A paper describes a structure:
It targets the membrane-proximal external region (MPER) of the [name]-1 viral spike with a highly hydrophobic antigen-binding region. Here we show cis-trans conformational isomerization of the Tyr-Pro-Pro (YPP) motif in the heavy chain 3rd complementarity-determining region (CDR H3) of antibody [name] to be the mechanistic basis of its multipeak behavior.
Compared to the SEC of [name], mutating either of these prolines resulted in the three-peak profile of [name] merging into a predominantly single peak, suggesting that the prolines cause the SEC anomaly. To define the structural basis for the anomalous SEC and HIC behavior, we determined the crystal structures of [name] with Pro100f to Ala ([name]-100fA) in two different space groups, Pro100g to Ala ([name]-100gA) and Pro100f and Pro100g to Ala ([name]-100fgAA) variant at 3.7 Å, 2.4 Å, 2 Å and 2.7 Å resolutions, respectively. Extensive hydrogen bonding networks were observed between the CDR H3 and the CDR L1 of [name], involving heavy chain residues, Tyr98, Ser100c, Pro100g, Gly100h and Glu100i, and light chain residues Ser30, Tyr32, Lys51 and Arg91. However, these hydrogen bonds were not retained in the Pro to Ala variants, suggesting the YPP motif to be critical for coordinating these hydrogen bonds, and disruption of these hydrogen-bonding interactions correlated with the degree that the CDR H3 conformations differed from that of wild type, their reduced binding affinities, and their reduced neutralization potencies. Masiero et al. propose Pro113 of [name] in a trispecific antibody (the equivalent of P100g in [name]) as being the most important residue to control the isomeric states of the YPP motif of [name]. Crystal structures of P100fA, [name], P100fgAA and H31LCF variants all showed “open” CDR H3 conformations, which correlated with reduced affinity to gp41, reduced neutralizing potency against select viruses, and reduced affinity to the column matrix.
Residue numbers in the entry:
A (entry chain H): 1 to 52, 52A, 52B, 52C, 53 to 82, 82A, 82B, 82C, ...
B (entry chain L): 2 to 9, 11 to 95, 95A, 95B, 95C, 96 to 209
Write the structure that this text describes.
């Protein structure tokens, strides 16, 4: 029925430009008010802007955080909403959502008091604003039931994938979310809890793949 | 931002919790409420004076008084663990909208479990790479919230610390990780370093020495 699909996200440097698009189906797009909402990773939702329908003359309103840098447009023929992002900054990362916007008002309240609500949302497209260059991680052993692991350090951009023993070992494996360090580079760790009797006897290898750098590393994790 | 919410609330499974949003704009506008989980789009829960969209369980309801708007979850289910956001006008009569800062709702669905803590010193390979990262692995705790403090000898360490938000393990307990990034010289310049993990008012500590 109602479908909203955002696209255009990706990597851009500070000062750069990028255009996001949201394709809509299953509703009257021509009369629909459409809103852009963003969520930086680990942070709250932020209203970016909204474009109205024909009754308000396709009027656009923007958050002060983006006014003068971001432009919202629509093509009713394509059922498409656009976000033109210019002079982007690091604070503009990351997930951008398109939402069909409803209007509510108490009819006979007698006090002018309208508000908007976001009834249908797309899944979002991720925008990373960063000056960092593509870089594969270094993989370091976290040597030791007992816990052992691999530290996947200083890579950009996300993601990295980590398996153990070529994917044959999954039970007891926990791969943590990445952290963004002050250097602009990500780091993560993957840990596995293993029988103590197996420490120097069974081999544990973490396999790290970083596609953006074509990095594939296999690190055997041995006791010290 | 003109809408304020408390960052975190807990509710017992099957019981009732109220999440509150406060702002001057709520004196003349209603709020709408959104649920957000990782990996999924926000979902509208409630809007206006008394409107719950079709498809939303009737355990979600909204209320409003004065500068305050409230989402009540009656009979919380485990699937209600999520962030909850209110939205309204940023100020009375405005053409703009804004979200509150969000409230993380924990639904307590299993007994308290204290964290196990493992602290890894820098590997020799990392030292040879001219870096020195201590890794504090925190596992098997419930509910999923911890505070981590680091100490060099006996002094609190500020810079160089990064910590992940707790992530669910396969046994449905939580794990977290914290990193202290040092140079090899800094690493070798202290007698010991300590990772201190406080969970529900109880602290577990582990220490390493170069």
């Amino acid at each position: 029925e109602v479908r909203l699909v955002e696209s255009g996200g990706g990597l851009v440097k500070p000062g750069g430009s990028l255009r996001l698009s949201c394709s809509a189906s299953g509703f009257d797009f021509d009369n629909a008010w459409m809103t852009w909402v963003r969520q930086p990773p680990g942070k709250g939702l932020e209203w970016v802007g909204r474009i109205t329908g024909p009754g308000e003359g396709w009027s656009v309103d923007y958050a002060e955080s983006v006014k003068g840098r971001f432009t919202i447009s629509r093509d009713n023929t394509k059922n498409t909403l656009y976000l033109e992002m210019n002079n982007v900054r690091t604070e503009d990362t990351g997930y951008y959502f398109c939402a069909r916007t409803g209007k509510y008002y108490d009819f006979w309240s007698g006090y002018p008091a309208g508000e908007e609500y976001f009834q249908d949302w797309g899944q979002g497209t991720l925008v990373i604003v960063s000056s960092a260059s593509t870089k594969g991680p270094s993989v370091f052993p976290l040597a030791p039931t007992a816990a052992l692991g691999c530290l996947v350090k200083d890579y950009f951009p996300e993601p990295v994938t980590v398996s153990w023993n070529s994917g044959a070992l999954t039970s007891g494996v926990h791969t943590f979310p990445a952290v963004l360090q002050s250097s602009g580079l990500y780091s993560l760790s993957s840990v596995v809890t293993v029988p103590s009797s197996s420490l120097g006897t069974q081999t544990y290898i973490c396999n790290v793949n970083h596609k953006p750098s074509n990095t594939k590393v296999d690190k055997k994790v041995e006791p010290k | 931002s003109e809408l304020t919410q408390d960052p975190a609330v807990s509710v017992a499974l099957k019981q009732t919790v109220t999440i509150t949003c406060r702002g001057d704009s709520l004196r003349s506008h209603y709020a709408s409420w959104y649920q957000k989980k990782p990996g999924q789009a926000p979902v509208l829960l409630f809007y206006g004076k008394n409107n719950r969209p079709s498809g939303i369980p009737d355990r979600f309801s909204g209320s409003a008084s004065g500068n305050r708007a409230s989402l009540t979850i009656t009979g919380a289910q485990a699937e209600d663990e999520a962030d909850y956001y209110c939205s309204s006008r940023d100020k009375s009569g405005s053409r703009l909208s804004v979200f509150g800062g969000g409230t993380k709702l924990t639904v307590l669905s299993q007994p308290k479990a204290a964290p196990s803590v493992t602290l890894f010193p820098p590997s020799s390979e990392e030292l040879q790479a001219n870096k020195a990262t201590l890794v504090c692995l925190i596992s098997d705790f419930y509910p999923g919230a911890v505070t981590v403090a680091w100490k060099a000898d006996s002094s609190p360490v500020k810079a160089g610390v990064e910590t992940t938000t707790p992530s669910k393990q396969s046994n449905n307990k939580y794990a977290a990780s914290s990193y202290l990034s040092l140079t090899p010289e800094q690493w070798k310049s202290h007698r010991s370093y300590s990772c201190q993990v406080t969970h529900e008012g109880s602290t577990v500590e582990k220490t390493v020495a170069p």
